[PDB]
Amino acid sequence: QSRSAKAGLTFPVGRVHRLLRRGNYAQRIGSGAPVYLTAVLEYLAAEILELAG
DNA sequence: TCGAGAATCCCGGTGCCGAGGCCGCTCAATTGGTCGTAGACAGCTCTAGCACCGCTTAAACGCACGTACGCGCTGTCCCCCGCGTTTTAACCGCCAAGGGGATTACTCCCTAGTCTCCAGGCAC
Structure with a gap:
């Protein structure tokens, strides 16, 4: 299972991780x-x- | 009345703790060849604001009843306030234990970089 749904949740994890990864x-x-x-x-x-x- | 002696006003001397300066120093400031990467310009389109007005159209301008209440005066009424008096704990100095803050760093553990394969995601 992907990281956006491995914890059984709704919001995406890769989206906020990409926002903080390039948000410095x-x-x-x-x-x-x-x-x-x-x-x-x-x-x-x-x-x-x-x-x- | 003279004069010597005690009290005081004003001038001169001296602690004193904070501002200013200083030697030693030691992990940062400078410069550098390079190197993946931001970024500035340009064709080209496409797309959002602007004007005119076709056609309606509620809404503001302004004047007229009228009465609710803002401002001022008058009386009321009482509650903090100045002051005196009694109490009380704050500040200061000091004795004492000790406890987390600070500094050193190593394996380990979690991340930057890497490529590889797949399931999200607004558009048709």
Whole structure:
């Protein structure tokens, strides 16, 4: 399974990893940080979508 | 009244702790040949704003009832405030234990680079 769906989530991981890789935010990057961004933004999106419903 | 002696005003001397300067120094500032890579210009199109107005069209300008309330005055009424008095803990100095902050670095572990194969993703 790809990294965008290995954790069973909704938001893509490769998209935010490509955004930080060329956005020049650090020298290196840990493996847990893009999926952590994935989890935080998908939880914020799900909460505001439940409130929108 | 003279004069000597004690008190005080003003002038001169001296601690004193913060601003200024300094020797030693030691990991950064300079320059360099190179090298993959940003980037600036240009044909060419294509596409979004602008003007005129065809045709309607609600909406603002401005004046007229009228009464709600902003500003000012008058009376009320009371609650912080100056002040006195009693209490109290803050600041300072000091004795004491010790505990995380700082500095050194190594295997290991996670990433830049690499190529290779595949499943996402807005357009038809």
